[PDB]
């Protein structure tokens, strides 16, 4: 509900992406699910890990604006042709109505994973505490987003019926992580 | 003239007597080049005479087939077209020479993998 919640039709507004503060004040440390599963099992094989707290975070930190730009480059949904553009979610009240309507109408599960509870998850920036063990303590070797995400989004690519010749789509530029010092400035 | 050969993709032959005569004539020339003691030269040279004369001896293809047996005249040609290829090819291999490769030890032994007591 993270790489699909941002690739779904509902999340957009005809081509757009309402992000809180354009996502520039949100910093996240997404972790590949397999690494998390490896952590759970490794914690299960070991008794030393009993009765302790573990934080499962990725190796790098990214601004939410930086990530979403990178997806839409991987998805070939670039602004130049496709028409992608980032609102500031505070400006448009239409979006909050969609979630409120969406939650009410659907009996089983919200469509596109969109509902006001999910919105608040997006806004809050990950706060990895210092001194609490991480999966590296459990021996897991974390996979970077660049390794995995480009293969996750292959079935969500736009204009996927093209049969492009080799080179007709240029490899997207990788995302730029946020340095620890930069987070201080980004948050004033 | 046969209406049809009876075999798909095999056409009735015009002047089979000529076509056979040329082919047998060609074979004897290719065979002639082979050394006299070669057993292949002795057999085909003997054989092709037995086929060649029957081709000239008989003028009716139906009578020819009985005189030679060994299939229809169309097939007789098909056969003859081969020994040209064999005889020509075999002037290059020189099979009459001695055994090219002496057999290895136990290379034709059956059943295999038994201790042999000297």
């Amino acid at each position: 509900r993270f790489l699909r919640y941002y690739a779904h039709i509902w999340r957009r507004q005809f081509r757009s992406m309402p992000l809180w503060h354009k996502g520039e004040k949100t910093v996240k440390q997404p972790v590949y699910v397999s690494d998390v599963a490896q952590a759970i099992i490794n914690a299960a094989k070991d008794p030393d890990s009993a009765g302790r707290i573990y934080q499962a975070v990725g190796p790098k930190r990214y601004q939410l604006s930086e990530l979403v730009d990178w997806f839409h480059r991987l998805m070939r949904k670039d602004q130049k042709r496709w028409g992608y553009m980032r609102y500031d979610m505070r400006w448009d009240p239409t979006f909050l109505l969609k979630a409120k309507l969406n939650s009410f109408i659907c009996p089983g599960t919200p469509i596109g994973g969109l509902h006001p509870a999910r919105i608040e998850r997006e806004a809050v920036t990950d706060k990895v505490l210092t001194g609490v063990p991480t999966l590296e303590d459990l021996g897991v070797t974390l996979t970077t987003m660049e390794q995995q995400v480009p293969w996750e989004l292959r079935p969500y690519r736009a204009a996927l019926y093209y049969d492009a010749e080799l080179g007709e789509f240029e490899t997207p530029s990788p995302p730029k992580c946020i340095e620890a010092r930069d987070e201080l400035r980004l948050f004033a | 003239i046969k209406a049809s050969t009876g075999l798909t993709g095999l056409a009735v032959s015009t002047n089979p007597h000529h076509t056979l005569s040329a082919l047998y004539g060609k074979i004897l020339r290719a065979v002639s080049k082979m050394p006299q003691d070669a057993s292949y030269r002795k057999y085909t040279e003997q054989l092709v005479k037995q086929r060649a004369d029957s081709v000239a001896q008989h003028k009716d293809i139906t009578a020819l087939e009985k005189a030679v047996g060994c299939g229809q005249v169309e097939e007789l040609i098909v056969q003859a077209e081969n020994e040209l290829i064999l005889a020509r090819k075999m002037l290059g291999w020189k099979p009459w020479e001695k055994l090219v490769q002496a057999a290895p030890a136990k290379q034709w032994d059956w059943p295999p993998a038994q201790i042999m007591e000297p």
Binding site: - | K26, R29, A30, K33, L84, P112
Partner: protein, 151 residues
């Protein structure tokens, strides 16, 4: 040869192609001590860990026939087995443990093992049994102890 047309392929082939067509007929020399481990396709892990025991299969003590020990054999190491959790069968992850091949002499067996990169070690060939007298009359001896008290 004879008049009959020449083969276009060889007749028209450039002198260079005929030359390499010759040395590919070749008969070049190569050393006879070779290792076929790369092409045999065995996983590399097995080739490094598992020994091969050249041996004659042991005669069945409970029988007098022998024609089932007239070969040399190879059997791999006896890796682990374990009870199957569900039904309790014997289970193993040891494909080569199932294996067995027959040979005529240890020299061939070593030759085969070297050509495939296996590590081997030969059990001592049973020395030919010493001659035994096995006389019947001695069962009834005048002053010797060989006299049998039964019959």
């Amino acid at each position: 040869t004879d008049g009959g047309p020449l083969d276009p392929k060889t007749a028209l082939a450039r002198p260079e192609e005929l030359e390499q067509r010759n040395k590919l007929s070749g008969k070049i020399t190569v050393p006879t001590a070779v290792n076929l481990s790369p092409i045999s396709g065995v996983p590399e892990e097995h080739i490094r860990e598992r020994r091969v025991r050249i041996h004659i299969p042991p005669k069945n003590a409970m029988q007098s026939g022998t024609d089932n020990v007239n070969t040399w054999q190879i059997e791999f190491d006896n890796r682990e087995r374990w009870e199957n959790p569900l039904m309790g069968w014997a289970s193993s992850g040891d494909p080569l443990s199932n294996m067995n091949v027959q040979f005529g002499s240890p020299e061939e067996a070593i030759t085969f093992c070297e050509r495939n990169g296996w590590r081997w070690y030969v059990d001592g060939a049973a020395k030919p049994k010493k001659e035994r007298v096995k006389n019947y009359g001695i069962n009834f001896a005048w002053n010797k102890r060989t006299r049998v008290s039964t019959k």
